[PDB]
């Protein structure tokens, strides 16, 4: 039930106690570095629903990124930027996911869940050997995380006609001149 | 004649066998496959463990054949299995 209560807190995150906690934690994050290691998540309920596991090989990294305009807007989200910076920092791990943890008037703060592919507990667990597979190298760089799908418009409906199957692939498919043998 | 008009009564020939289906001048291969399908198969009857046999034996020794009494007992019957469960275990074991 405790995770349900935490979910309700995160829903009413503008309340007094949550505002105080985010204030203190924002001060702490400003005092720490731009990128740093968490053994335990700040929002365990959010980490658990995103897939964080209490196993040897799962880590959280907390990262602060500059917010604002790039009037040309930077099409990559700050979440994707934080995940990419985490990737260049620890290229050895695999980016499982990411979630917003805090924000300020200059920096926005994210916590990324990362998985170690070379640890045999992760190899054995058949729910995570998929990210152990080599196809998932630098998912943050290829835009394969949740922010990547959201920015790529990987949704069903007439609202996503141009991007449901890949923007560039759809463009190429529509602009190829196919010529059959019997024309 | 169907008083209640549903075609399903015409089509028919709340539990069903779910691990198998009960089924009721032609090529040699087809007849060979039919014979292979209709060949009888080994039963491989599942049996019971030694401690289960001993527990059932003690329960019979004490309570005779009263399913209610064996369900009622606590010491000889810690896992509070139902009297019907005990009865079918005894029937499978062989002793009444």
């Amino acid at each position: 039930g405790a995770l349900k209560y935490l979910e309700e807190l995160s829903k009413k995150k503008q309340s007094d106690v949550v505002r105080f906690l985010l204030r203190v934690r924002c001060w702490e994050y400003r005092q720490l570095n731009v990128i740093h290691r968490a053994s335990r998540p700040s929002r365990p309920d959010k980490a658990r629903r995103l897939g964080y596991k209490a196993k040897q090989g799962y880590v959280i990294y907390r990262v602060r990124v500059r917010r604002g305009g790039r009037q040309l807007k930077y099409q990559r989200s700050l979440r994707a930027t934080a995940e990419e910076r985490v990737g260049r920092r620890c290229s050895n791990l695999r980016v499982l996911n990411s979630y917003w943890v805090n924000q300020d008037s200059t920096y926005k703060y994210y916590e990324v869940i990362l998985v170690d592919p070379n640890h045999k507990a992760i190899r054995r667990d058949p729910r995570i050997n998929w990210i152990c597979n080599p196809v998932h190298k630098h998912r943050e760089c290829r835009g394969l995380t949740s922010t990547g799908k959201k920015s790529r418009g990987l949704n069903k409906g007439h609202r996503f006609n141009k991007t449901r199957a890949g923007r560039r692939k759809t463009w190429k498919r529509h602009n190829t001149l196919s010529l059959w043998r019997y024309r | 004649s169907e008083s209640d008009a549903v075609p399903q009564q015409q089509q028919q020939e709340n539990h069903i066998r779910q691990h198998d289906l009960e089924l009721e001048s032609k090529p040699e291969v087809l007849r060979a496959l039919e014979r292979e399908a209709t060949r009888p198969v080994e039963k491989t009857v599942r049996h019971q463990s030694e401690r289960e046999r001993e527990w059932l034996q003690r329960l019979v020794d004490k309570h005779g054949d009263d399913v209610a009494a064996m369900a009622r007992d606590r010491k000889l019957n810690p896992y509070q299995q139902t009297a019907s469960d005990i009865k079918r275990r005894l029937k499978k074991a062989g002793l009444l």
Binding site: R127 | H19, L30
Partner: peptide
Amino acid sequence: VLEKTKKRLTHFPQRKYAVKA
């Protein structure tokens, strides 16, 4: 493989059959 899938493939395996002409 997972325990659930192992039990499922143990109790409901792929059957070998034929459809008559």
